Design an enzyme around this catalytic site. Structure first.
Site, PDB file in Angstrom:
ATOM      1  CG  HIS A  69      -6.241   2.306   1.950  1.00 34.31           C
ATOM      2  ND1 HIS A  69      -7.446   2.042   1.343  1.00 34.31           N
ATOM      3  CD2 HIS A  69      -5.404   1.314   1.572  1.00 34.31           C
ATOM      4  CE1 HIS A  69      -7.337   0.947   0.617  1.00 34.31           C
ATOM      5  NE2 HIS A  69      -6.105   0.491   0.734  1.00 34.31           N
ATOM      6  CG  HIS A 202      -1.725  -8.585   3.392  1.00 39.53           C
ATOM      7  ND1 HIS A 202      -1.809  -8.869   2.048  1.00 39.53           N
ATOM      8  CD2 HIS A 202      -2.232  -7.344   3.545  1.00 39.53           C
ATOM      9  CE1 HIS A 202      -2.344  -7.841   1.418  1.00 39.53           C
ATOM     10  NE2 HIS A 202      -2.620  -6.908   2.306  1.00 39.53           N
TER      11      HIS A 202
END
Ligand code: HEM
Ligand code: HEM
Lengths: 660, 662, 241
Positions: A69, A202
């Site tokens: 992020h 992921h």
């Protein structure tokens, strides 16, 4: 509303630095027990604090998310955002909708940070935390480079990529493809790199959403002072642990949720999918007709069947991505290769030239998005430089032309991602040779190239900056104000094979106020574009003022027009620009509705003696700028203007000299 | 909307100064041909530029107005505004409705400014221009003091007009209602009734007002007009727009018949002629001397005259029973008028300049005035042994580290940066009314000892001994933490008399809040942390400076009332970084005790026991991210000596803020 | 030479004549170094002096920061060749009133020679002699040149008492390395001194610095000058830095 943000230029001064203006980050880092810090972080990865318990005892999937992020606010169009300045700690970004629970991730880092001090910076610590998180799960990293020095203000000069629930909350994986493509391309990632990033990101960790989203309290910059910097409190159950609500969904992608593997693709293709929703009524995809293999993060007696996000099924059902995804499905070592390359890139893309990297894990392979430079094949002596100066002086280029080529080569530097500048001689290679604003400056290249064949003692980047040095020294002598113009040698010429035209076409100015070039007339105002250029150069308002005026008298106009040439001795470095600009003798009228050209006539005879653009005339309209103009136009400010312009010039010559 | 303004603390840095950070205004001024500058200004007074022709050939009426508008934004409650910083050149004030045509006045000054450079500053040049304007009409001035050094940013403070609507309150042309308006507005500036009379009657003897036609003819203010207007606003389509068509206020009033000579005619006409109601061409209410002849020369057309006229605001004086008496006092004695006006004018233009030691130049008056906060010449000259001896004495007195630090801070922390008042020079902590203020109550208990130490030693003043007490306290506390340091001391302060401390103008200096000692007075005024910022700004501190001092004052136990709010340590009186370490340590969770959330308990998140208490002033430093970014620096493992040095430097800076004598 | 290595603790310096008293502070520090395993004995040995000077400055009402550079290491007997280190033994250390033999040179010439070996200036040497005298840093702890009553506080008492015409100085014997001060009025005997204390009032270049330090405005000044010279002599062998 309609303002000139001269106030951008004031940020990051002596007043807000708590550390002093002598703090050398590099030299402090030299003291770091780098591998012992890595040991303490690995320790941290599994030490579970009661006010935010670890999933499967592991905070690793939390730290990878924090580091990603951080890096993902980057933009390729100007170089702003990214993870190079540690900005995720301050407002506004610390409070944006997409960073809920990253405040606790940052809080869990404070004991290591405190034990170490300024020896490591928050902005380096974040990326390294994510790296260690990856390295401890079985995965191997490309390499890491420290050097992000910390700052103390939130940068005023300005949904990280996409919505996990398909675009416009329509649970169709199809429509999400174009969104991912555009958003990730804006960051300079291609198709394959996007596949690798998403699929890798992921495999570890999970998403959190036990209950309704309304249980979550306000973001860090809106919460009660007793919350001590933490936002998004939750009334649901415990509010933490197995009750965490952040994103709002409940997806676990693998069955060894803390070990690297190839299971993301495996289950992705090895199952159909149905559409359900997490308890917070958000769309989820569920592996259909599957057994119980996924261990539950806090109960060792319950299981769950695989699940996915819309944005995880885009890189499967979509035809384009399918092929990379199966490439990697049947080759997980290729998967590891590609993911690791892309991850190093993503976290080092706004760091700049390899000379800015420090530490013991800096990869040895040069990459193209680093804008690489070769080792030098020249070591010019002192006579060699005096000789080159006699030669350039005797070549027949005018003060205007010499100054033009030096400025055209140096002024590509941006401060955000540290790209551009005069090192490399990209002015000579494609595509800068053929840019609109460079057209005139280029007419001085074939001479210098020849002076560089005859002398094989310096590089063309050094000779290019030296040409500007000669031009400025000549012009100071013409005004009776002789000065020394400093020169730092040792630049190198790069090869077309290291200048990727596509990523250098992003460096083309829409406007360069310092040479009277604007491109289009629907983007912003000429004077705000001027501010924006000056900020990218890390200048102060005085610096910008002195340089505009100097470049005007030296006649450094692109196309060499006479807009704003307020003098009769073009090529001598005087304060004539500010004197004529401010003297109430002339009144200025706009020539047409596209009010970017004005005529000066004499308020007494009426005759037209000067022309100017909005970039010349903001310096008598904005009061903060006119306050500096008057300083330079006043009777005791001839030597002062010369010294100030010379210092600013040399500062813009040396912005990309991180090798020094 | 609801945001700490830590960005107050960043203004006026190295980045925005176009001059060095070495420029000494005083030393530049030493080079000024001061009387030759006055010669060139009086020359300018009559050199008429075609883009703005002079009224009666004279710009004087124009300059006096510009200097008065400069000075008239002053406020007595905190010391902001006024004419001491030259701020009328920058936004926002350069564009306020009340300064239409003052951009011309500033523009006409640029050739003198340019010839002279930084040797005079814009902020001094304005007031001097007004002075010369007065001295050239026949009027004599009280004196002038230069020293206003120029700045380069617009001060972000909180503030339309300067004092009142010229047209009566709410545009209702009744002089009566204008009385209370004038009274309040001028009083908050620090002027009494007589001074108001003198100012309004003097200001309106020279010059005139401008309003040939409909105001709609006038264009946009300077911060809103086309970039080709080059800094000038309020352009006008009416006729020429300038000269005899100049429109600024919109009203057309000429008060005397020698509109360029001093006289006593304002009062003369005011009482002699009666008045009737009309309106200037732009539809604004006017008063005109009724049954009068034609006597007032017209500013541009010779063969034309006009009968006296007045503003609504000119007719409160003479009618409001209160003012009539001063106004007739002055009618039947214009020498009194001249004396009073000149004293009030000097005051008005030097009220935010501070102590006489800041005045420079060859016209500084010799009479000390009461609004200057005067100080006497010293009767002491402490040697080096005398200071070592005083330090042994204070150390051996029995005051604690807490008490000593308390008295030093209580004496120094009254300084404001805006109008330069307060500080430790004078020993006002000892005289009224500061001896008896709520926040000083505890600190005051260390006064009778020091006074005795000052009788026994007749070698220093009590202001110097008071600051020396704090020096001893800090040096002791640094030695307790194993981090011994030298605390610098500048001697030579003087003690003042009750006769120089006007209780009324020192009761404005009473803190509503001093976050550095955990005192907040009322609960309707602001938040505790914004009040903290505001205090720190008044002290001209940086955010690091404010952080370091809060923490230090917490461990030394410098709480007023000596409570244990924010005392995050066990060694109270030793100067450690314990405050930041305990504040940031995720061990304790903090809870608010009641709905008036200014008190919180810390209990440890494990056992739950209550170990600390704090207020909003202790806890902003872990809630605002810019402040926490400095907290962490001081809480980190390599920052013991660093915290000590930073706190000591900030302390000495706050000890020396009012040492303009140095 | 120098403080890096802790050769004071190993042979042969442990057993040198001039070190005899100083050595009585070794077994304490060694113990403080077992209990703390966080620094070396060379660093703890220089830190001891840092604490001593800071205490003495606080006693004189002139508190100061004494800088400390850590990171020294302790050497092993195997790296200290006794025959090579026996050449480092002082024939004289004027700064602590040790002179060995009486047929080499003058005590004050040996003082100059020691100061040169330390790369000092004349002011530096003056300030250090005086400071070391009030702190009572005499080897054998005699009261030669201790011109004060507050022994252990860092004042300018040495130069003040040395220059004030109150006392006349007589030589005690034909050796002439020992003199008594008596009051030129009462006759009593208040001080003793050696040639190393008394060159600072006989040579005019040296007395010109003495007077600077003895003058009314030179309390903080003497303290700062002595502290800077001390730290310079602590760091002479820090070529690792
Ligand atoms: C299309 C782009 C992406 C989308 C739509 C997306 C979406 C999400 C969402 C909704 C969550 C749940 C957050 C929570 O509730 O805690 C999540 C978690 C996570 N994301 Fe992504 N993400 C994207 C890209 C990436 C990338 C590029 C990486 C790493 C390179 C990454 C790493 C992670 C990790 C490790 C987690 C697990 C969080 C945990 O264990 O708490 N994501 N992602
Ligand atoms: C109740 C307080 C005051 C009111 C209501 C007031 C009002 C006005 C108005 C409306 C004008 C006309 C402006 C224009 O159209 O150009 C004016 C002009 C003027 N004011 Fe005042 N004023 C006040 C106080 C003062 C003070 C205190 C001074 C000086 C100490 C002063 C000095 C002047 C002068 C000299 C002019 C003539 C302007 C010229 O010649 O252009 N005024 N005033």
């Amino acid at each position: 509303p309609n303002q000139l943000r001269v106030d951008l230029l004031n940020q990051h001064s002596n007043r807000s630095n708590p550390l002093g203006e002598d703090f050398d980050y590099r030299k402090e880092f030299s003291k770091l027990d780098y591998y012992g810090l890595k040991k303490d972080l690995k320790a941290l990865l599994t030490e579970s604090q009661p006010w935010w318990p670890a999933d499967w005892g592991s905070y690793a999937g939390l730290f990878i998310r924090m580091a990603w992020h951080g890096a993902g606010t980057y933009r390729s169009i100007d170089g702003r955002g990214g993870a190079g300045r540690g900005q995720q700690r301050f407002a506004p970004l610390n409070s944006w909708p997409d960073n809920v629970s990253l405040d606790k991730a940052r809080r869990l880092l404070w004991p290591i940070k405190q034990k170490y001090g300024q020896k490591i910076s928050w902005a380096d610590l974040f990326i390294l935390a994510g790296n260690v998180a990856l390295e401890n799960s079985g995965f191997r990293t490309f390499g890491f480079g420290a050097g992000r020095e910390d700052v103390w203000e939130p940068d005023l000069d300005v949904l990280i990529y996409v919505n996990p629930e398909g675009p416009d909350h329509s649970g169709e994986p199809l429509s999400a493809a174009a969104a991912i493509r555009a958003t990730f391309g804006n960051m300079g990632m291609n198709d394959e790199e996007t596949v690798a990033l998403i699929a890798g990101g992921h495999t570890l960790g999970k998403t959190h959403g036990a209950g309704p989203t309304s249980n979550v309290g306000p973001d860090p910059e809106a919460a009660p002072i007793e919350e001590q910097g933490l936002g998004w409190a939750s009334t649901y159950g415990s509010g933490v642990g197995a009750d965490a609500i952040t994103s709002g969904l409940e997806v676990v992608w693998t069955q060894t949720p803390t070990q690297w593997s190839n299971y993301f693709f495996e289950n992705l293709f090895k199952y159909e999918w149905v559409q359900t929703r997490s308890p917070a009524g958000a769309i989820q995809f569920e592996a259909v007709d599957a057994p119980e293999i996924i261990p539950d993060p806090f109960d060792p007696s319950k299981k769950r069947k695989p699940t996915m996000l819309v944005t995880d099924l885009t890189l499967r059902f979509d035809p384009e991505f399918e092929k990379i995804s199966r490439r990697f499905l049947n080759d997980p070592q290729a998967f590891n290769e590609a993911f690791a390359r892309a991850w190093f890139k993503l976290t080092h893309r706004d760091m700049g030239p390899k000379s800015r990297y420090i530490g013991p894990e800096v990869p040895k392979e040069d990459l193209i998005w680093q804008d690489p430079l070769p080792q030098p094949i020249y070591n010019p002596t002192e006579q060699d430089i005096i000789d080159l100066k006699f030669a350039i002086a005797d070549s027949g280029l005018s003060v205007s032309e010499l100054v033009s080529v030096a400025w055209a080569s140096a002024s590509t530097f941006r401060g955000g991602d540290k790209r551009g500048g005069a090192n490399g001689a990209r002015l000579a290679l494609m595509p800068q040779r053929d840019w609109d604003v460079n057209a005139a400056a280029v007419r001085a290249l074939p001479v210098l190239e020849k002076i560089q064949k005859e002398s094989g003692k310096a590089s063309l980047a050094d000779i290019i900056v030296l040409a500007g040095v000669v031009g400025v020294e000549k012009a100071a002598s013409a005004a009776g104000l002789s000065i020394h113009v400093p020169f730092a040698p040792g630049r190198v010429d790069a090869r077309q094979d290291q200048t990727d035209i596509e990523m250098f076409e992003l460096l083309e100015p829409i406007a360069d106020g310092f040479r009277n070039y604007r491109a289009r007339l629907d983007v912003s105002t000429t004077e705000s574009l001027l501010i924006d250029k000056a900020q990218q150069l890390t200048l102060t308002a005085p610096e910008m003022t002195a340089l505009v005026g100097g470049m005007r008298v030296l006649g450094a106009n692109f196309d060499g027009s006479k807009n704003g040439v307020f003098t009769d001795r073009v090529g001598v470095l005087s304060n004539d620009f500010f004197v004529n600009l401010l003297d109430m003798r002339y009144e200025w009228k706009a020539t047409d509705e596209s009010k970017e050209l004005f005529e000066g006539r004499d308020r007494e005879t009426g005759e037209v003696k000067f022309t100017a653009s909005r970039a010349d005339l903001v310096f008598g309209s904005n009061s903060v700028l006119r306050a500096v103009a008057e300083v330079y136009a006043s009777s005791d400010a001839h030597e002062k203007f010369v010294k100030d312009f010379v210092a600013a010039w040399v500062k813009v010559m040396n912005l990309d000299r991180f090798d020094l």
